[PDB]
Amino acid sequence: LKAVIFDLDGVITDTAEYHFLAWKHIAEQIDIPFDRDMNERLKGISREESLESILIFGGAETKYTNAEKQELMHRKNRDYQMLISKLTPEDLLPGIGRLLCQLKNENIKIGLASSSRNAPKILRRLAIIDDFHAIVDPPDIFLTAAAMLDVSPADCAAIEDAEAGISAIKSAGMFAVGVGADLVVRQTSDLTLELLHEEWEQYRIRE
Amino acid sequence: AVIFDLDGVITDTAEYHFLAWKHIAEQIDIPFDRDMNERLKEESLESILIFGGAETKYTNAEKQELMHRKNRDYQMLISKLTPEDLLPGIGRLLCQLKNENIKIGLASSSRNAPKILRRLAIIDDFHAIVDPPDIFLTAAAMPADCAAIEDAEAGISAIKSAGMFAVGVGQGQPMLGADLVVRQTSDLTLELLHEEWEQYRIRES
């Protein structure tokens, strides 16, 4: 086992939360109580669709023009990016830092496979960017990561939380960790180098 | 080499201590809320009782069992501890101290620390767990080439008076007896510890 390739969302950064908060603050500004339950139902729902559900709870889907709903949605996003900009190292997902440590302490190459154009900026904001020896600039965005790390895909694990990403990792011929994947953990804290080793050892045998 | 109090440094058990008391309050049927909890940070029991208007209701030996039941309840709830309750910089800080065979110690007042450390999944990373300013010494015994970290004025001075370098986690006057003061557990990394230590080390000689 030579490299571990990370994605950003739900793996390194708690983007999900930040989307929750985004949605919430807009709702304050629009005078509608938001909460996580509503949030959890609006998981995987169109941005425009989510907003309509919030508006319907507030009996306000008729109060607002399309134009205004557009701006609504625009602000949510600026709020979100704004929130993402104030990231600190206390915002690092549990288990992650310690995991990096082990991988380095053990001389495993570490990579990043995120679609975000601000990744380097973020890894820096999180104080872990020195840990990465390859960051891909925005499938096989994963095959690129392995090229950069100078290692076979067969010898890499990629950690991910998105349906699609896991497809990509798999198609890219790597051991895929989900957080339809080769190994699945509940929360990031569950990721130890030790579990990774063991499960990865088994993975390659079953082929 | 480096020593930790538990609560406020490695993890936060506040919620559990709270619940623990609230179950007792309920058993006595006396009003109890998080506001009180904070304010009351045995004297405590009397307080809720005096407040509850039941200052005469309980003996002392009964009163003692009311406490025994509480340590027992608490000791249970902390079962709900996962490594997810480890504090920001900690886990990594720990894997590093290990990598560089710096030694890892727990000098906590907590009576349940061993179970706590095991739920956090880090318990193996330690080598001295204290068992009840003597404390951090006892820990060292388990020694001026020593670091320790606290989040309270009390712990802080107990450390310096133990003659080591004292790293404070928090902010304010509660912090002004500390060698180092990071505003949160994340800020504290094996690097920063080192850089600020060799500077303390020198100022000795």
mmCIF file of C-alpha atoms in Angstrom:
data_model
loop_
_atom_site.group_PDB
_atom_site.id
_atom_site.type_symbol
_atom_site.label_atom_id
_atom_site.label_comp_id
_atom_site.label_asym_id
_atom_site.label_seq_id
_atom_site.Cartn_x
_atom_site.Cartn_y
_atom_site.Cartn_z
ATOM 1 C CA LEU A 1 0.000 0.000 0.000
ATOM 2 C CA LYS A 2 1.686 3.178 -1.298
ATOM 3 C CA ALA A 3 -0.723 6.103 -1.588
ATOM 4 C CA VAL A 4 -3.969 7.358 -0.130
ATOM 5 C CA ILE A 5 -6.002 9.790 -2.207
ATOM 6 C CA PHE A 6 -8.566 11.951 -0.447
ATOM 7 C CA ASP A 7 -11.551 13.911 -1.635
ATOM 8 C CA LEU A 8 -12.646 17.010 0.269
ATOM 9 C CA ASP A 9 -16.328 16.956 1.216
ATOM 10 C CA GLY A 10 -17.507 14.872 4.115
ATOM 11 C CA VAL A 11 -14.043 13.386 4.131
ATOM 12 C CA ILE A 12 -11.823 16.276 5.176
ATOM 13 C CA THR A 13 -14.230 19.137 5.512
ATOM 14 C CA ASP A 14 -17.675 19.147 7.062
ATOM 15 C CA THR A 15 -19.181 20.810 4.024
ATOM 16 C CA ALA A 16 -22.562 19.248 4.822
ATOM 17 C CA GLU A 17 -22.788 21.162 8.064
ATOM 18 C CA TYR A 18 -21.771 24.313 6.260
ATOM 19 C CA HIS A 19 -24.556 23.797 3.783
ATOM 20 C CA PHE A 20 -26.947 23.288 6.688
ATOM 21 C CA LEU A 21 -25.879 26.550 8.305
ATOM 22 C CA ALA A 22 -26.024 28.365 4.950
ATOM 23 C CA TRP A 23 -29.623 27.317 4.445
ATOM 24 C CA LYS A 24 -30.412 28.227 8.049
ATOM 25 C CA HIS A 25 -29.097 31.782 8.038
ATOM 26 C CA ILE A 26 -30.976 32.619 4.863
ATOM 27 C CA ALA A 27 -34.048 31.303 6.644
ATOM 28 C CA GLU A 28 -33.494 33.627 9.571
ATOM 29 C CA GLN A 29 -33.106 36.441 7.122
ATOM 30 C CA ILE A 30 -36.365 35.237 5.619
ATOM 31 C CA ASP A 31 -38.028 34.607 8.970
ATOM 32 C CA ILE A 32 -38.482 30.848 8.751
ATOM 33 C CA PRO A 33 -37.255 28.362 11.359
ATOM 34 C CA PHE A 34 -35.031 25.787 9.734
ATOM 35 C CA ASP A 35 -33.529 22.955 11.876
ATOM 36 C CA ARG A 36 -31.791 19.712 10.824
ATOM 37 C CA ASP A 37 -34.851 17.535 10.395
ATOM 38 C CA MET A 38 -36.076 19.660 7.539
ATOM 39 C CA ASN A 39 -32.454 19.684 6.438
ATOM 40 C CA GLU A 40 -32.164 15.885 6.456
ATOM 41 C CA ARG A 41 -35.288 15.579 4.280
ATOM 42 C CA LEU A 42 -33.873 18.110 1.864
ATOM 43 C CA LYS A 43 -30.793 15.924 1.408
ATOM 44 C CA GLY A 44 -30.221 15.362 -2.312
ATOM 45 C CA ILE A 45 -32.894 17.856 -3.243
ATOM 46 C CA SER A 46 -32.387 20.477 -5.957
ATOM 47 C CA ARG A 47 -31.209 23.857 -4.606
ATOM 48 C CA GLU A 48 -34.235 25.513 -6.214
ATOM 49 C CA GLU A 49 -36.406 22.655 -4.917
ATOM 50 C CA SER A 50 -35.077 22.900 -1.357
ATOM 51 C CA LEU A 51 -35.876 26.615 -1.260
ATOM 52 C CA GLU A 52 -39.457 25.941 -2.388
ATOM 53 C CA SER A 53 -39.936 23.512 0.488
ATOM 54 C CA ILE A 54 -38.615 26.034 2.995
ATOM 55 C CA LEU A 55 -40.900 28.657 1.482
ATOM 56 C CA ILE A 56 -43.842 26.281 1.666
ATOM 57 C CA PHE A 57 -43.224 25.621 5.373
ATOM 58 C CA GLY A 58 -43.321 29.366 5.920
ATOM 59 C CA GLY A 59 -46.396 29.688 3.737
ATOM 60 C CA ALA A 60 -44.328 31.980 1.535
ATOM 61 C CA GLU A 61 -43.864 30.160 -1.782
ATOM 62 C CA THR A 62 -46.176 32.794 -3.235
ATOM 63 C CA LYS A 63 -44.536 35.803 -1.539
ATOM 64 C CA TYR A 64 -41.464 35.682 -3.756
ATOM 65 C CA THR A 65 -40.759 36.127 -7.457
ATOM 66 C CA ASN A 66 -38.468 33.816 -9.373
ATOM 67 C CA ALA A 67 -35.998 36.683 -9.547
ATOM 68 C CA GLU A 68 -35.996 36.996 -5.764
ATOM 69 C CA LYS A 69 -35.721 33.259 -5.206
ATOM 70 C CA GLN A 70 -32.717 33.412 -7.534
ATOM 71 C CA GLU A 71 -31.059 36.056 -5.384
ATOM 72 C CA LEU A 72 -32.055 34.017 -2.347
ATOM 73 C CA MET A 73 -30.195 31.070 -3.756
ATOM 74 C CA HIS A 74 -27.304 33.325 -4.734
ATOM 75 C CA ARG A 75 -26.865 34.557 -1.169
ATOM 76 C CA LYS A 76 -27.010 31.043 0.302
ATOM 77 C CA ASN A 77 -24.016 30.294 -1.904
ATOM 78 C CA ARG A 78 -22.086 33.435 -0.949
ATOM 79 C CA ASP A 79 -22.819 32.661 2.676
ATOM 80 C CA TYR A 80 -21.466 29.163 2.074
ATOM 81 C CA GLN A 81 -18.270 30.268 0.338
ATOM 82 C CA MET A 82 -17.922 32.912 3.047
ATOM 83 C CA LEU A 83 -18.232 30.174 5.674
ATOM 84 C CA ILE A 84 -15.720 28.032 3.815
ATOM 85 C CA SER A 85 -13.343 30.983 3.803
ATOM 86 C CA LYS A 86 -13.260 31.208 7.583
ATOM 87 C CA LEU A 87 -12.140 27.595 7.980
ATOM 88 C CA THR A 88 -9.654 26.916 10.765
ATOM 89 C CA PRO A 89 -7.731 23.837 11.892
ATOM 90 C CA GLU A 90 -10.348 23.124 14.541
ATOM 91 C CA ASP A 91 -12.685 22.491 11.610
ATOM 92 C CA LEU A 92 -10.816 19.359 10.547
ATOM 93 C CA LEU A 93 -12.926 16.215 10.546
ATOM 94 C CA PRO A 94 -12.299 13.897 13.482
ATOM 95 C CA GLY A 95 -9.714 11.184 12.971
ATOM 96 C CA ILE A 96 -8.238 12.845 9.896
ATOM 97 C CA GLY A 97 -5.155 14.589 11.307
ATOM 98 C CA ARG A 98 -4.092 11.497 13.233
ATOM 99 C CA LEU A 99 -4.575 9.468 10.044
ATOM 100 C CA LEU A 100 -2.315 11.745 8.028
ATOM 101 C CA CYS A 101 0.252 11.445 10.809
ATOM 102 C CA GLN A 102 0.303 7.662 10.535
ATOM 103 C CA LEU A 103 0.482 7.669 6.755
ATOM 104 C CA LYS A 104 3.431 10.081 6.837
ATOM 105 C CA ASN A 105 5.038 8.323 9.827
ATOM 106 C CA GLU A 106 4.805 5.251 7.627
ATOM 107 C CA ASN A 107 5.878 6.931 4.379
ATOM 108 C CA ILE A 108 2.631 6.504 2.422
ATOM 109 C CA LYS A 109 2.099 9.081 -0.291
ATOM 110 C CA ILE A 110 -0.895 11.349 0.325
ATOM 111 C CA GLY A 111 -2.964 12.914 -2.440
ATOM 112 C CA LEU A 112 -6.047 15.037 -2.995
ATOM 113 C CA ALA A 113 -8.702 14.442 -5.678
ATOM 114 C CA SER A 114 -11.179 17.288 -5.239
ATOM 115 C CA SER A 115 -13.165 19.103 -7.891
ATOM 116 C CA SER A 116 -12.846 22.324 -5.917
ATOM 117 C CA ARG A 117 -10.557 24.979 -7.384
ATOM 118 C CA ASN A 118 -9.930 26.308 -3.890
ATOM 119 C CA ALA A 119 -8.614 23.067 -2.430
ATOM 120 C CA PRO A 120 -5.001 24.203 -1.927
ATOM 121 C CA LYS A 121 -6.356 27.319 -0.284
ATOM 122 C CA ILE A 122 -8.527 25.169 2.005
ATOM 123 C CA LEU A 123 -5.901 22.551 2.897
ATOM 124 C CA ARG A 124 -3.783 25.502 3.945
ATOM 125 C CA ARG A 125 -6.620 27.047 5.957
ATOM 126 C CA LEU A 126 -6.743 23.662 7.738
ATOM 127 C CA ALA A 127 -3.000 23.446 8.294
ATOM 128 C CA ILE A 128 -2.575 20.086 6.588
ATOM 129 C CA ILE A 129 -1.541 21.093 3.068
ATOM 130 C CA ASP A 130 2.082 20.242 3.779
ATOM 131 C CA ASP A 131 0.888 16.666 4.291
ATOM 132 C CA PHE A 132 -0.261 16.372 0.723
ATOM 133 C CA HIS A 133 2.355 15.649 -1.915
ATOM 134 C CA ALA A 134 -0.094 15.827 -4.798
ATOM 135 C CA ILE A 135 -3.177 17.927 -5.403
ATOM 136 C CA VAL A 136 -5.052 17.463 -8.657
ATOM 137 C CA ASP A 137 -6.385 20.504 -10.492
ATOM 138 C CA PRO A 138 -10.027 20.148 -11.628
ATOM 139 C CA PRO A 139 -13.610 9.447 -14.169
ATOM 140 C CA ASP A 140 -9.877 9.375 -13.633
ATOM 141 C CA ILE A 141 -9.102 12.581 -11.841
ATOM 142 C CA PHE A 142 -7.874 9.761 -9.640
ATOM 143 C CA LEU A 143 -5.578 8.251 -12.278
ATOM 144 C CA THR A 144 -3.965 11.651 -12.491
ATOM 145 C CA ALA A 145 -3.438 11.723 -8.728
ATOM 146 C CA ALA A 146 -1.574 8.415 -8.952
ATOM 147 C CA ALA A 147 0.503 9.656 -11.864
ATOM 148 C CA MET A 148 1.537 12.624 -9.752
ATOM 149 C CA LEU A 149 2.383 10.357 -6.797
ATOM 150 C CA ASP A 150 4.358 8.061 -9.061
ATOM 151 C CA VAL A 151 2.431 4.943 -8.023
ATOM 152 C CA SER A 152 0.047 2.389 -9.559
ATOM 153 C CA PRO A 153 -3.751 2.811 -9.027
ATOM 154 C CA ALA A 154 -3.794 -0.795 -7.884
ATOM 155 C CA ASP A 155 -1.692 0.270 -4.935
ATOM 156 C CA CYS A 156 -3.835 3.200 -3.818
ATOM 157 C CA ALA A 157 -6.898 3.665 -1.642
ATOM 158 C CA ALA A 158 -9.151 6.654 -2.181
ATOM 159 C CA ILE A 159 -11.479 7.897 0.506
ATOM 160 C CA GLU A 160 -14.780 9.413 -0.484
ATOM 161 C CA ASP A 161 -18.348 10.149 0.584
ATOM 162 C CA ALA A 162 -20.108 10.683 -2.761
ATOM 163 C CA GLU A 163 -21.920 8.034 -4.818
ATOM 164 C CA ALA A 164 -20.204 9.354 -7.941
ATOM 165 C CA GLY A 165 -16.718 9.676 -6.472
ATOM 166 C CA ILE A 166 -16.873 6.004 -5.485
ATOM 167 C CA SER A 167 -17.821 5.034 -9.022
ATOM 168 C CA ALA A 168 -14.847 7.075 -10.249
ATOM 169 C CA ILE A 169 -12.428 5.515 -7.773
ATOM 170 C CA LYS A 170 -13.607 2.056 -8.671
ATOM 171 C CA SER A 171 -13.598 2.653 -12.415
ATOM 172 C CA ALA A 172 -10.125 4.075 -11.798
ATOM 173 C CA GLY A 173 -9.210 0.622 -10.536
ATOM 174 C CA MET A 174 -8.533 1.540 -6.924
ATOM 175 C CA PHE A 175 -9.591 0.306 -3.537
ATOM 176 C CA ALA A 176 -12.480 2.644 -2.693
ATOM 177 C CA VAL A 177 -13.287 3.691 0.883
ATOM 178 C CA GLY A 178 -16.732 5.178 1.460
ATOM 179 C CA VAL A 179 -17.737 7.306 4.441
ATOM 180 C CA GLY A 180 -21.275 0.341 -3.440
ATOM 181 C CA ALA A 181 -17.710 0.643 -2.152
ATOM 182 C CA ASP A 182 -14.981 -1.786 -1.117
ATOM 183 C CA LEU A 183 -14.933 -0.689 2.538
ATOM 184 C CA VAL A 184 -17.371 1.562 4.373
ATOM 185 C CA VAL A 185 -17.113 3.551 7.573
ATOM 186 C CA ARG A 186 -19.829 5.430 9.451
ATOM 187 C CA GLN A 187 -17.853 8.571 10.365
ATOM 188 C CA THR A 188 -14.329 9.836 9.569
ATOM 189 C CA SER A 189 -13.093 8.990 13.040
ATOM 190 C CA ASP A 190 -13.486 5.350 12.070
ATOM 191 C CA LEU A 191 -10.590 5.666 9.642
ATOM 192 C CA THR A 192 -7.412 4.271 11.097
ATOM 193 C CA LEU A 193 -4.348 3.306 9.154
ATOM 194 C CA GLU A 194 -4.771 -0.042 10.803
ATOM 195 C CA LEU A 195 -8.272 -0.661 9.459
ATOM 196 C CA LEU A 196 -7.128 0.624 6.108
ATOM 197 C CA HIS A 197 -4.247 -1.831 5.994
ATOM 198 C CA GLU A 198 -6.240 -4.874 7.011
ATOM 199 C CA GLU A 199 -9.256 -4.229 4.802
ATOM 200 C CA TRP A 200 -7.002 -3.265 1.912
ATOM 201 C CA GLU A 201 -5.072 -6.484 2.372
ATOM 202 C CA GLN A 202 -8.287 -8.491 2.105
ATOM 203 C CA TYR A 203 -9.538 -6.395 -0.859
ATOM 204 C CA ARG A 204 -6.616 -7.302 -3.146
ATOM 205 C CA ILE A 205 -6.855 -11.019 -2.300
ATOM 206 C CA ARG A 206 -10.486 -11.136 -3.417
ATOM 207 C CA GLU A 207 -9.004 -10.444 -6.858
ATOM 208 C CA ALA B 1 7.685 14.086 28.587
ATOM 209 C CA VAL B 2 4.147 15.489 28.183
ATOM 210 C CA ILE B 3 1.138 15.220 30.535
ATOM 211 C CA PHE B 4 -2.594 15.850 30.239
ATOM 212 C CA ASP B 5 -5.515 16.547 32.476
ATOM 213 C CA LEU B 6 -8.517 14.925 30.848
ATOM 214 C CA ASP B 7 -11.490 17.268 30.802
ATOM 215 C CA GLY B 8 -11.084 20.365 28.639
ATOM 216 C CA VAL B 9 -7.846 19.045 27.122
ATOM 217 C CA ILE B 10 -8.314 15.534 25.686
ATOM 218 C CA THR B 11 -12.101 15.541 25.788
ATOM 219 C CA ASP B 12 -15.184 17.297 27.181
ATOM 220 C CA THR B 13 -17.304 15.266 29.603
ATOM 221 C CA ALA B 14 -19.356 18.280 30.776
ATOM 222 C CA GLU B 15 -22.644 16.996 29.305
ATOM 223 C CA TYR B 16 -22.270 13.731 31.201
ATOM 224 C CA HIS B 17 -21.542 15.361 34.545
ATOM 225 C CA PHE B 18 -24.636 17.478 33.888
ATOM 226 C CA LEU B 19 -26.943 14.573 33.043
ATOM 227 C CA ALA B 20 -25.546 12.669 36.007
ATOM 228 C CA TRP B 21 -26.674 15.361 38.478
ATOM 229 C CA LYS B 22 -29.975 15.932 36.688
ATOM 230 C CA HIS B 23 -30.918 12.269 37.228
ATOM 231 C CA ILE B 24 -30.291 12.793 40.939
ATOM 232 C CA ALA B 25 -32.244 16.054 41.023
ATOM 233 C CA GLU B 26 -35.076 14.145 39.394
ATOM 234 C CA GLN B 27 -34.819 11.277 41.909
ATOM 235 C CA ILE B 28 -35.164 13.867 44.675
ATOM 236 C CA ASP B 29 -37.718 15.778 42.648
ATOM 237 C CA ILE B 30 -35.985 19.108 42.902
ATOM 238 C CA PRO B 31 -35.783 21.682 40.097
ATOM 239 C CA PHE B 32 -32.469 21.471 38.232
ATOM 240 C CA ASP B 33 -31.257 23.226 35.093
ATOM 241 C CA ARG B 34 -28.066 23.907 33.195
ATOM 242 C CA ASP B 35 -27.919 27.371 34.734
ATOM 243 C CA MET B 36 -27.563 25.856 38.212
ATOM 244 C CA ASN B 37 -25.182 23.221 36.918
ATOM 245 C CA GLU B 38 -22.872 26.017 35.792
ATOM 246 C CA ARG B 39 -23.298 28.012 39.039
ATOM 247 C CA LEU B 40 -22.490 24.922 41.106
ATOM 248 C CA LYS B 41 -19.125 24.814 39.331
ATOM 249 C CA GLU B 42 -21.002 17.664 48.300
ATOM 250 C CA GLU B 43 -21.424 21.398 48.756
ATOM 251 C CA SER B 44 -23.219 21.040 45.442
ATOM 252 C CA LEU B 45 -25.728 18.437 46.620
ATOM 253 C CA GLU B 46 -26.658 20.583 49.655
ATOM 254 C CA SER B 47 -27.146 23.476 47.253
ATOM 255 C CA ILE B 48 -29.718 21.717 45.112
ATOM 256 C CA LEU B 49 -31.272 20.379 48.317
ATOM 257 C CA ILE B 50 -31.281 23.745 50.083
ATOM 258 C CA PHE B 51 -32.530 25.301 46.882
ATOM 259 C CA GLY B 52 -35.028 22.491 46.465
ATOM 260 C CA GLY B 53 -36.271 23.222 49.967
ATOM 261 C CA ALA B 54 -35.417 19.702 51.118
ATOM 262 C CA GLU B 55 -32.466 20.553 53.310
ATOM 263 C CA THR B 56 -33.733 18.315 56.087
ATOM 264 C CA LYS B 57 -35.000 15.456 53.928
ATOM 265 C CA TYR B 58 -31.843 13.380 53.764
ATOM 266 C CA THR B 59 -29.429 11.960 56.297
ATOM 267 C CA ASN B 60 -25.718 12.061 55.581
ATOM 268 C CA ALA B 61 -25.266 8.356 54.914
ATOM 269 C CA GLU B 62 -28.312 8.406 52.643
ATOM 270 C CA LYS B 63 -26.913 11.557 51.149
ATOM 271 C CA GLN B 64 -23.691 9.599 50.600
ATOM 272 C CA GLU B 65 -25.529 6.899 48.662
ATOM 273 C CA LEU B 66 -27.254 9.586 46.617
ATOM 274 C CA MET B 67 -23.690 10.330 45.547
ATOM 275 C CA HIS B 68 -22.621 6.749 45.070
ATOM 276 C CA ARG B 69 -25.578 6.220 42.707
ATOM 277 C CA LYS B 70 -24.357 9.279 40.804
ATOM 278 C CA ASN B 71 -20.782 8.168 40.257
ATOM 279 C CA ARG B 72 -22.330 4.951 39.043
ATOM 280 C CA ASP B 73 -24.709 6.640 36.621
ATOM 281 C CA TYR B 74 -21.955 8.856 35.269
ATOM 282 C CA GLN B 75 -19.632 5.856 34.923
ATOM 283 C CA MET B 76 -22.265 4.448 32.606
ATOM 284 C CA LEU B 77 -23.127 7.390 30.396
ATOM 285 C CA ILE B 78 -19.513 7.837 29.436
ATOM 286 C CA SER B 79 -19.989 4.560 27.638
ATOM 287 C CA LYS B 80 -21.463 6.864 24.993
ATOM 288 C CA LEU B 81 -17.940 8.092 24.330
ATOM 289 C CA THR B 82 -16.478 7.468 20.861
ATOM 290 C CA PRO B 83 -13.229 8.656 19.337
ATOM 291 C CA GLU B 84 -15.415 11.328 17.772
ATOM 292 C CA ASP B 85 -15.300 13.033 21.196
ATOM 293 C CA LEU B 86 -11.575 13.490 21.034
ATOM 294 C CA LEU B 87 -10.584 17.169 20.881
ATOM 295 C CA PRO B 88 -9.216 18.756 17.626
ATOM 296 C CA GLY B 89 -5.425 18.797 17.792
ATOM 297 C CA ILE B 90 -5.283 15.929 20.216
ATOM 298 C CA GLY B 91 -5.369 12.690 18.232
ATOM 299 C CA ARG B 92 -2.684 13.902 15.840
ATOM 300 C CA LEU B 93 -0.638 15.563 18.582
ATOM 301 C CA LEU B 94 -0.681 12.133 20.149
ATOM 302 C CA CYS B 95 0.367 10.141 17.116
ATOM 303 C CA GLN B 96 3.316 12.542 16.841
ATOM 304 C CA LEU B 97 4.474 12.452 20.454
ATOM 305 C CA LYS B 98 4.412 8.681 19.935
ATOM 306 C CA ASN B 99 6.387 8.779 16.714
ATOM 307 C CA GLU B 100 9.116 10.717 18.526
ATOM 308 C CA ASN B 101 8.928 8.532 21.643
ATOM 309 C CA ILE B 102 8.022 11.516 23.745
ATOM 310 C CA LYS B 103 6.151 10.043 26.699
ATOM 311 C CA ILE B 104 2.410 10.477 27.245
ATOM 312 C CA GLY B 105 0.776 10.924 30.606
ATOM 313 C CA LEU B 106 -2.586 11.406 32.230
ATOM 314 C CA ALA B 107 -2.741 13.296 35.470
ATOM 315 C CA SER B 108 -6.487 13.715 35.858
ATOM 316 C CA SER B 109 -8.829 13.936 38.847
ATOM 317 C CA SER B 110 -11.323 11.834 36.879
ATOM 318 C CA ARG B 111 -12.001 8.511 38.551
ATOM 319 C CA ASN B 112 -13.092 6.906 35.278
ATOM 320 C CA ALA B 113 -10.244 8.013 33.002
ATOM 321 C CA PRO B 114 -9.107 4.505 32.063
ATOM 322 C CA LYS B 115 -12.556 3.703 30.634
ATOM 323 C CA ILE B 116 -12.681 7.171 29.101
ATOM 324 C CA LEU B 117 -9.301 6.738 27.428
ATOM 325 C CA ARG B 118 -10.387 3.370 26.105
ATOM 326 C CA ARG B 119 -13.628 4.696 24.577
ATOM 327 C CA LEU B 120 -11.556 7.396 22.854
ATOM 328 C CA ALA B 121 -9.370 4.624 21.411
ATOM 329 C CA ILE B 122 -6.195 6.378 22.466
ATOM 330 C CA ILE B 123 -5.691 4.602 25.771
ATOM 331 C CA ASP B 124 -2.767 2.644 24.389
ATOM 332 C CA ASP B 125 -0.945 5.880 23.575
ATOM 333 C CA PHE B 126 -0.503 6.499 27.277
ATOM 334 C CA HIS B 127 1.958 5.003 29.710
ATOM 335 C CA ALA B 128 1.166 6.762 32.972
ATOM 336 C CA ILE B 129 -2.443 7.037 34.101
ATOM 337 C CA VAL B 130 -2.771 8.621 37.545
ATOM 338 C CA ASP B 131 -5.156 6.785 39.842
ATOM 339 C CA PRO B 132 -6.808 9.340 42.116
ATOM 340 C CA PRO B 133 0.251 19.706 42.660
ATOM 341 C CA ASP B 134 1.271 16.213 43.756
ATOM 342 C CA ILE B 135 -0.735 14.606 40.937
ATOM 343 C CA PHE B 136 1.301 15.633 37.840
ATOM 344 C CA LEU B 137 4.423 14.703 39.813
ATOM 345 C CA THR B 138 2.982 11.310 40.608
ATOM 346 C CA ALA B 139 2.467 11.255 36.852
ATOM 347 C CA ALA B 140 6.057 12.235 36.165
ATOM 348 C CA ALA B 141 7.091 9.619 38.721
ATOM 349 C CA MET B 142 5.148 7.122 36.632
ATOM 350 C CA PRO B 143 10.810 15.017 35.002
ATOM 351 C CA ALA B 144 11.487 18.679 34.298
ATOM 352 C CA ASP B 145 11.996 17.699 30.692
ATOM 353 C CA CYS B 146 8.226 17.704 31.048
ATOM 354 C CA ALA B 147 5.203 19.284 29.404
ATOM 355 C CA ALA B 148 1.658 19.296 30.770
ATOM 356 C CA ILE B 149 -1.552 20.884 29.530
ATOM 357 C CA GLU B 150 -4.591 22.271 31.370
ATOM 358 C CA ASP B 151 -7.654 24.456 30.819
ATOM 359 C CA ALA B 152 -8.065 25.777 34.367
ATOM 360 C CA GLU B 153 -6.189 28.282 36.559
ATOM 361 C CA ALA B 154 -6.008 25.567 39.190
ATOM 362 C CA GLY B 155 -4.447 22.940 36.966
ATOM 363 C CA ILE B 156 -2.220 25.614 35.508
ATOM 364 C CA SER B 157 -0.530 26.624 38.755
ATOM 365 C CA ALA B 158 -0.390 23.043 40.045
ATOM 366 C CA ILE B 159 1.758 22.454 36.983
ATOM 367 C CA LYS B 160 4.162 25.372 37.307
ATOM 368 C CA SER B 161 4.446 24.673 41.034
ATOM 369 C CA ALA B 162 5.352 21.136 39.958
ATOM 370 C CA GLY B 163 8.198 22.948 38.226
ATOM 371 C CA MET B 164 7.487 22.163 34.582
ATOM 372 C CA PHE B 165 6.411 24.176 31.560
ATOM 373 C CA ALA B 166 2.644 24.737 31.693
ATOM 374 C CA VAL B 167 0.553 24.910 28.528
ATOM 375 C CA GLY B 168 -2.775 26.600 28.962
ATOM 376 C CA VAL B 169 -5.802 25.941 26.818
ATOM 377 C CA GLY B 170 -8.265 28.790 27.024
ATOM 378 C CA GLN B 171 -8.252 32.541 27.317
ATOM 379 C CA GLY B 172 -8.199 35.365 29.834
ATOM 380 C CA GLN B 173 -6.876 35.993 33.309
ATOM 381 C CA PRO B 174 -7.691 32.341 34.044
ATOM 382 C CA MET B 175 -4.696 31.802 31.788
ATOM 383 C CA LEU B 176 -2.064 34.213 33.124
ATOM 384 C CA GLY B 177 0.306 31.845 34.931
ATOM 385 C CA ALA B 178 1.029 29.781 31.847
ATOM 386 C CA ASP B 179 4.183 29.393 29.773
ATOM 387 C CA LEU B 180 2.128 28.844 26.653
ATOM 388 C CA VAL B 181 -1.511 29.643 25.959
ATOM 389 C CA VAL B 182 -3.337 28.358 22.908
ATOM 390 C CA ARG B 183 -6.936 29.461 22.445
ATOM 391 C CA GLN B 184 -7.974 25.908 21.509
ATOM 392 C CA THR B 185 -6.686 22.317 21.355
ATOM 393 C CA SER B 186 -6.168 22.595 17.606
ATOM 394 C CA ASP B 187 -3.598 25.405 17.893
ATOM 395 C CA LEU B 188 -1.438 23.026 19.880
ATOM 396 C CA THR B 189 0.816 20.939 17.639
ATOM 397 C CA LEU B 190 4.016 19.009 18.326
ATOM 398 C CA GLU B 191 5.830 21.721 16.396
ATOM 399 C CA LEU B 192 4.649 24.718 18.407
ATOM 400 C CA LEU B 193 5.262 22.788 21.616
ATOM 401 C CA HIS B 194 8.904 22.193 20.623
ATOM 402 C CA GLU B 195 9.693 25.733 19.436
ATOM 403 C CA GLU B 196 8.272 27.314 22.572
ATOM 404 C CA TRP B 197 9.901 24.700 24.816
ATOM 405 C CA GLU B 198 13.546 25.009 23.789
ATOM 406 C CA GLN B 199 13.003 28.726 24.492
ATOM 407 C CA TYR B 200 11.752 27.943 28.009
ATOM 408 C CA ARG B 201 14.569 25.365 28.369
ATOM 409 C CA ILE B 202 17.216 27.940 27.594
ATOM 410 C CA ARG B 203 15.716 30.612 29.880
ATOM 411 C CA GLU B 204 16.368 28.074 32.637
ATOM 412 C CA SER B 205 20.129 27.755 32.005
#
